[PDB]
Amino acid sequence: YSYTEKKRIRKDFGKRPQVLDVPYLLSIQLDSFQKFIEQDPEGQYGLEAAFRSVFPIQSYSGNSELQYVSYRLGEPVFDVQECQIRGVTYSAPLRVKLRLVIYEREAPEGTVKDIKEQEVYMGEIPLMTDNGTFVINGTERVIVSQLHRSPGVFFDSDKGKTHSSGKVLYNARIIPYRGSWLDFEFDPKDNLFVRIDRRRKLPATIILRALNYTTEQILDLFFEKVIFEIRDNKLQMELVPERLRGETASFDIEANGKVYVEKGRRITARHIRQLEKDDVKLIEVPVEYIAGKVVAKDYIDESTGELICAANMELSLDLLAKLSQSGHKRIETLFTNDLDHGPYISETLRVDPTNDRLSALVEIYRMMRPGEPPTREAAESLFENLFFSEDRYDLSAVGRMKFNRSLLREEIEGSGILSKDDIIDVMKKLIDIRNGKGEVDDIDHLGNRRIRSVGEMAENQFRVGLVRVERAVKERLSLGDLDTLMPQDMINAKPISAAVKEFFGSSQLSQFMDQNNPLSEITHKRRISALGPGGLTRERAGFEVRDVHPTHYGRVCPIETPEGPNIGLINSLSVYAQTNEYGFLETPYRKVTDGVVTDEIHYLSAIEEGNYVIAQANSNLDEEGHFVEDLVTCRSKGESSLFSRDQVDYMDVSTQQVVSVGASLIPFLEHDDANRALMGANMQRQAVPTLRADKPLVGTGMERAVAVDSGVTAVAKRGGVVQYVDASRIVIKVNEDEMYPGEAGIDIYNLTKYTRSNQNTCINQMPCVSLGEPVERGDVLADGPSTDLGELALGQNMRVAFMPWNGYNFEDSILVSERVVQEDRFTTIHIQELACVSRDTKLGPEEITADIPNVGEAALSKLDESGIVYIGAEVTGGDILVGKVTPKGETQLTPEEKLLRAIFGEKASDVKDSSLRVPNGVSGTVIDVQVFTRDGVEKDKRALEIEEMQLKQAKKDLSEELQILEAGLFSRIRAVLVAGGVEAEKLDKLPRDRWLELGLTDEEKQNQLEQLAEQYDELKHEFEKKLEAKRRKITQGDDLAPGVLKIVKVYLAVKRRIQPGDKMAGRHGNKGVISKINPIEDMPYDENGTPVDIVLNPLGVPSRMNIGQILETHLGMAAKGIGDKINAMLKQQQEVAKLREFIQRAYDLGADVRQKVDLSTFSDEEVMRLAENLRKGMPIATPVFDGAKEAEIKELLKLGDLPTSGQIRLYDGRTGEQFERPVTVGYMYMLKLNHLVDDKMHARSTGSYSLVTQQPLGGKAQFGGQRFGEMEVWALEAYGAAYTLQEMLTVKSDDVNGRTKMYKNIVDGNHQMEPGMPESFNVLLKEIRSLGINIELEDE
């Protein structure tokens, strides 16, 4: 075990050896975007791919052309931190080297005319953070991967389109990555058609005619042949035995000298096999049989040279006789059959109005460009530019791959352009499917659904920006001068920058990162969405795609997706699942050779998975041998059953791989209903971090991995000893063996303190190490906001009892002890952000002064000279934070105010009042202020004071950097100087500033001194430039929006304590709202005196079927029982030996505990720190389906000396007498969700009204009213409450004079109704009359 694990070991109840560890959870994000920026030399990827796809391009004339050389990302002008504070996007400038080459017109391709080569800027591309976010306008945003139908081929059929007939019409669709769609479909008359971009329908043969296929050839492609030899007089036919099947024999079928089948007789298997065995080839047949057979090829009279019969012509007795006498004694007709080989193309040629190739091209052209006179040029060009042009069409390697595999080809990669064979083969397979051989795909199968990550999407939008600029370039190249015109003068950055900014901004997949919880971020970045551009819509979404598909096993979680309209579309990735190189999903499986289960792992794609039989993870292994049991539970072809041991090809790696990350955190998932588990996992994401990070007693194991991988915790880059711990930072000195010989080797981590989250929560990092502690690489140095010693800590476990209590836990309602509030454990921090904007108006600039009309001294006390509240100041609703004043223009003073202002003098001043104040009923402490001024406007006094702080603090920070770096660097040189000329304290006597002149003998260690000497001066000059940069940025006058002169941002911190109305829940989908905070005197308490913290209603269990919470409670109680035993032993101080005895016995409890934890390796002190942590309650890991079983939990309770039932006798705090029976009591890990009543409470009497409709506005932020909607109206109508109704329609809403009159009446007591007519109605009439419908009021 690691050093951080020595501090607190979790007890594991798992039995299945995990052959594979969980991968880096944000793998997808990082790999993808890395590929996008990664400059690949040949195999174009991301950026490189976009350039090569478009470039090189030439002008319209063809003489001038632009070619791409190479690109480079500039380093970002502002780092992440600065970007977040300022509100700027974190991006890298994209400079691209381009070469303008011009050809001569008189010379053939005179490339040595004019070649201008230079580097042009064109847009800054947003960069991805270390943890897979993007910083856009100062907020962290995550681009969620998308899931769409893979480019390629797909066969489908509307299952009974015409509902009367209910005939199944099969269709093929070729979907490219870029281009027009090409659809093949059947009609009810079994004729094959073609459509482009679902336009009007065309006979399918028309497209083959475009590809230059004569009628003869088309039939030879799709059809087989029936040959007829005409010998002497009688007609002979060439026979294939297995054609005549399921049919009725029309004539007397005989051969040489044996009659087989009679007229009107069914031809069964036996007959066919008889005929085949006899070796029948030719059979005499009646002439009358030919009537109905279609001739395949053309036949001409050799004598005359004219057409006797054209191809695809139904044969008759006349034609046949004519053909015989011309001299043709062999006739190719179409093999064809109602059942098996259907004549589709034959019939489609009869419907085909075109003749030759050119005619076919014209008809295609006339479909898509109807009316417009066709020209041969335009038709040829159009058809080629549809699916046969490199520019406009591209299946992509994924499209070609999927296409080739669906057609059962051998080669995966190839042409992105459609070849002739490709089309034909799609038609053939479509026809095959019609005949009955083959089946249609679905769409829901993950073999047909592909995942499109961030890098590929950025790549696509970047291609678009290129294409827009390409238009502009071509246009300017044509008219442009060859000599004067520079390449960078033609290029505009704006189209590209616009396209990209629009993606990372406007796109649905790009959204505000959900960061009210580490889990929330990590799962959000592991999300997949079927929505957005190139995907489904909520409206357009069916039920088929939404529901759980067999292929989802090991790839997508079946238990993680929103219960909204986004139910089937948005989905979290399974744990072990990964992105295939082509973009499909794949899951790890352990290969089994001859029964023996090897440790080699293979990731299987969806398609590959169906081929092999895969055993479940729950099969019992025979100690590195094979399956214990002769019958094994396995699955293949999407279906599950029993198999023999040797039959098994693979097996599931982990028991966890079926579920997502979120669902894995749920202990005892196995005993919860899936519905509830879905809600539990969803609600776990909404857990708000409390003040005190409490670890969960009853965990799973995933806690540690989530916290660490999320990146919110600070982890150690290189192992070594901690040189300086601090609240603000941590300095760790690295071990010699890992410590590089170049630098000093002292790592510095500044910790991010009290910062605002997107949900207005509080993000602070705490150090979790002691000063001078030895630490291993990859250990947690500092905990993030909801983490504890490396583990995920979303909520807080507590003592729960399940019982009714006077209906205060009625319908999930929660009765909680005052103790919980007193200890402030659920109390939460919220950091809110208030801004005061000073804009420039037509009348003049708004000012941020403290000098405001009508302000009390009390109010101005907290404001400084500038008009800004001081740091630290406690505020409450109504207090002014940032004073601001605005120039008022004339106002018509009513004659009364003229008289009054003449009486009092009080002539009204030029300035008004737009000061930013504390929103009503929020109250907190101002913890930081930031000021933004434009470059030219005179700065505030307060702004100067903030800059003073920043400058001097920046100098200290950088000075400490070079000081501790200088100290660590000379400490090395001191050691190198010892290796050769050791004079330890004699060298330290004279000052360290005069040290590097001393050398050594001519050896490699003398060169080591040169390396440290070169780096020390490098660090010296580097420190100069760093500080120059810092100083510039602090001085830097910010470029804000046009109109805005200066902005002041204030950050309040509020302490929110829990209260009735707040929302709490566990991880089993058990919600509840706090109803009552009961005094601790009233709380049920056990024999020992210990009172319960929460009382939950047991009536919210059997209906819910979430039994995980009961198991959690029992295991929770046992965990705490052990904790109290350890706690008791520590208070007594027995001795190390005794603690070690108990703890060893404890760890090694379970029936087949996987993890062994021998305490003999642990030194006595290590044992003490461990026990110190375990006293609060021994933490236990229940893996998902590999969890603790009932037996194991009861055994743990006996070690706690707790009852096997887990029920204890409880006493009523009010009466003192016992409750009649035992109640289940233990620790459940619970969470306070983001839904604070504070945010929810709202009330309005009278306020602003809407613009046109005149009715009150909506929303609490705008001080809005609740909507009384149609539903709500109907209620009142039913009841017959007429006045209340009318009241809500008129005086309470639009009726303007009515509302004012009503208000006056109410203040004067008399509740008189004085109603009129709603203004919205008036508006309606006017809108109808603007339509040109006369709608008039006829009065009485």
Partner: protein, 50 residues
């Protein structure tokens, strides 16, 4: 489905039983979100005519 869930909640379902349960569960939950529109629209038509 031809194979029903033989196990129960107290005993704990295995990976495959749990997965098999999902389908039906989710179908139900989606029906809440999606079908109530049509139920409510019926209510609206009734109301309008009465």
């Amino acid at each position: 489905i031809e194979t029903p869930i033989t196990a129960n909640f107290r005993e704990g379902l295995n990976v495959l039983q749990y997965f098999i349960s999902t389908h039906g569960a989710r179908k139900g939950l989606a029906d809440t979100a999606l079908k109530t529109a049509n139920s409510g629209y019926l209510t609206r038509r009734l109301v309008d005519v009465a």
